[PDB]
Each structure stands twice: as C-alpha cells, then as structure tokens.
Amino acid sequence: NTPREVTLHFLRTAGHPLTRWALQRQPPSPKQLEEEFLKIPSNFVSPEDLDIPGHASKDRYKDILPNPQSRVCLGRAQDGDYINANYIRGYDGKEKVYIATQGPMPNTVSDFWEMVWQEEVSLIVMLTQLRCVHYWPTEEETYGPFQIRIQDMKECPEYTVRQLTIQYQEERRSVKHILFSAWPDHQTPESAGPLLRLVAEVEESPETAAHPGPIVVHSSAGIGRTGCFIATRIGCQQLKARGEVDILGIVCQLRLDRGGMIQTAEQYQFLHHTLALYAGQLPE
Amino acid sequence: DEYV
Ligand SMILES: [Cl-]
Ligand SMILES: [Cl-]
Ligand SMILES: [Cl-]
C-alpha cells in the first residue's frame, strides 16, 4: 500500500460507534479521544496534486486546497471553473448535502454567488469570530451578473439570520443566510447550547429552491469550524434516527470529501460534548 | 498565507 492507499483505507474503515447511553453516561476519556483524533489522516491535497492553472489567486491559504474528486466546478456564465469548495456527503453518505468552502475573498465574491446560483443553494451557514470581506450587502449590491438585496434581518443571541434575494437576469431566488459568531478559528465555542440552536435553525429552514441543493457552510479556511458544524449536524441525525452515533466515522467521511475537516483534538472533544447535549435534549 |  502507498501512503495514499493507507490514508484512504483508514478513512473508509475506521469507526467508533457508541450507543447514546455510552455517549451520555460512559464516554471515552479525553485522552482516549485525543489519541483517536490524532490517528485520523488529514487527506490534505498538496499544491503538486492540483493542476489548475491560476487557482492560487483564489485560495485564502496555500496549504488548504479542495480535493479534486469532490471540488465544485464553476460553469461558464459568469475563463476557469475554480473555487475553493468541495461537495460534502451527509447522513448515510447522501451526496452533495453540503458545500464546505472558505470565506470568499474580494476577488472570489462573484465566484461564490455563481456557486450559490448554479447549485441552487437556499441556505448559507457562516461560522466566524466577530472580533473576511462582507460578500452580502447592507441593502443592495451587484457582484458580477448578480444583484443581491436584503429582504429581512433578525438578531438573536446565538446568530443573525438574513433573508436575501439573488437576481440573475429576470430570475429572482431566495437565500437564507445565518451568521454564527463567537467561534474563533482553531478553537471551540465556550458552550454547546447556541451551536445546537443553530443546528435546529438549519433543520427548521424550508427548502426554497426548484430542486434540493447543498447547504453552503463556510469559515475562514473552510475546514475546522466548517467540519465541526457539519459533523455536529450528521451526529444529531444519527442520534435521532438510530439512538447511536459514530463520531470517528463521521469525521473520516468528511475528510474523504475535504482534507483537514475538524482541526483539533479539542474540537473533536467538543463535538462529543455537543452531541451528548443533543442526546439529553431529545424528546421523551 | 498559512492556516495550519
Ligand atoms: Cl466513506
Ligand atoms: Cl442528510
Ligand atoms: Cl455547554
């Protein structure tokens, strides 16, 4: 086995399923969770692995690149097809449930809205520390061929919801945007309550597109906080549907889709806590 | 830029 085959084999076969009782009442130790996390290969793509002339100008970080097999390719309207974003599988490996991407840069804002248009995205989840360019308007802006207007904006302690319309030619679409702050990169939130409220907000969001599309989830680099959010959502789904969760397997599936998803042992430990809270909050 |  080549290093890469070893990596892919691990990511396809690792697992640590836990009954919800084990998760809530007898979880693995912090040391056990750290050792388990550190075993998971990054599956990072090297700049050499990527043969897309001109891509570097559209990456926030030279070391964080989209895996080619799952990268989102931009169509021709809006010369290249590149955006630093990957399709991410959801519950039970369901295809294209999410797109994980970096926060747009001024020169990739039109690319970002083209992705939203092309993929029929109706929901954007943005993870940040309010302490990256605003790619949405205060009232109305034009970005390439797209006009974006704010229809509604509501504030709660946990997040801000903006209701946006995107217009391309005579066609207008709705996009819900949720901005969740107080999550510093390479770290976790101080408590898990707000995060679960965010998951509920996402779960409660109606479909508004002509065909179901991916939920776009982003943060500065689009791997750490982005990976934690998606893993939390899939974990909640497992707990609700099956009364068990395989958090190791979730992280491994995420890393097959985009390298480096969930950055730190502390974030992996926080995922366990958040899912134990979700389990405790389940009806009945 | 570097993130890790
Ligand atoms: Cl898999
Ligand atoms: Cl799903
Ligand atoms: Cl908490």
Side-chain angles (χ1 to χ4, degrees), chain A residues 1-61 63-68 70-129 132-138 141-148 150 152-169 171-284, chain B:
Chain A
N1 278 238
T2 57
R4 206 218 166 206
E5 293 172 322
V6 173
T7 289
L8 295 176
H9 182 263
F10 184 103
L11 296 172
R12 284 170 186 147
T13 61
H16 191 171
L18 302 156
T19 59
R20 86 170 256 198
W21 184 90
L23 178 68
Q24 293 184 263
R25 296 291 172 84
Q26 199 178 66
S29 72
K31 182 192 184 168
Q32 285 174 321
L33 294 181
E34 177 165 40
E35 286 167 346
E36 174 168 282
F37 184 74
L38 287 178
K39 279 182 191 166
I40 312 171
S42 289
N43 204 30
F44 278 133
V45 134
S46 83
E48 296 78 40
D49 295 337
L50 224 64
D51 186 359
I52 306 170
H55 79 79
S57 75
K58 294 180 172 281
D59 301 317
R60 181 172 274 102
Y61 308 101
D63 61 336
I64 308 289
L65 301 172
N67 301 57
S70 57
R71 81 175 175 97
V72 181
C73 302
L74 295 185
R76 301 193 69 163
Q78 268 149 60
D79 51 355
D81 71 0
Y82 185 84
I83 182 170
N84 193 314
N86 293 92
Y87 297 108
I88 311 292
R89 295 172 289 163
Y91 185 78
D92 272 356
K94 180 175 169 59
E95 298 294 321
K96 303 181 169 185
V97 181
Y98 314 86
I99 289 162
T101 189
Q102 69 183 21
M105 292 183 297
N107 68 311
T108 73
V109 170
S110 295
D111 292 334
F112 178 92
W113 290 116
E114 184 188 352
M115 183 174 61
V116 161
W117 193 270
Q118 163 190 299
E119 299 294 326
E120 305 195 70
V121 168
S122 59
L123 180 57
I124 298 174
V125 175
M126 164 173 174
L127 313 154
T128 197
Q129 54 173 317
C132 302
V133 66
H134 286 197
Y135 60 86
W136 67 89
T138 323
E141 295 291 329
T142 302
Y143 306 102
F146 308 103
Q147 196 190 30
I148 323 288
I150 316 291
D152 305 290
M153 174 181 135
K154 68 173 174 184
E155 292 280 359
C156 351
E158 299 82 9
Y159 47 82
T160 305
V161 175
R162 290 169 173 88
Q163 290 287 357
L164 312 177
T165 53
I166 170 159
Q167 185 186 296
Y168 178 70
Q169 303 173 13
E171 193 177 343
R172 283 166 266 251
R173 292 175 187 174
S174 196
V175 183
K176 182 169 174 185
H177 180 272
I178 310 164
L179 191 167
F180 182 89
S181 189
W183 200 339
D185 59 79
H186 302 73
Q187 308 291 342
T188 63
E190 293 271 37
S191 66
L195 177 56
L196 291 180
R197 279 257 322 156
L198 173 69
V199 169
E201 183 72 44
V202 169
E203 209 67 54
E204 264 69 305
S205 296
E207 227 297 294
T208 56
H211 316 92
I215 295 158
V216 168
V217 189
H218 77 82
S219 63
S220 314
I223 57 158
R225 291 165 291 175
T226 288
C228 291
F229 172 77
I230 297 174
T232 299
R233 207 283 187 98
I234 299 170
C236 289
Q237 295 174 307
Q238 290 186 10
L239 286 167
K240 185 173 171 189
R242 306 201 290 244
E244 46 200 57
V245 66
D246 183 355
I247 297 167
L248 177 52
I250 292 169
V251 177
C252 285
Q253 177 190 286
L254 293 178
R255 297 217 173 157
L256 287 161
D257 294 335
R258 178 171 173 91
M261 295 288 268
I262 299 97
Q263 277 204 120
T264 68
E266 180 185 51
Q267 290 170 344
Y268 192 69
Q269 286 161 349
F270 187 77
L271 184 49
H272 283 72
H273 171 76
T274 299
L275 293 168
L277 183 58
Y278 178 83
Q281 291 181 347
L282 276 165
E284 288 188 293
Chain B
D1 213 334
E2 212 137 60
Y3 186 80
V4 202

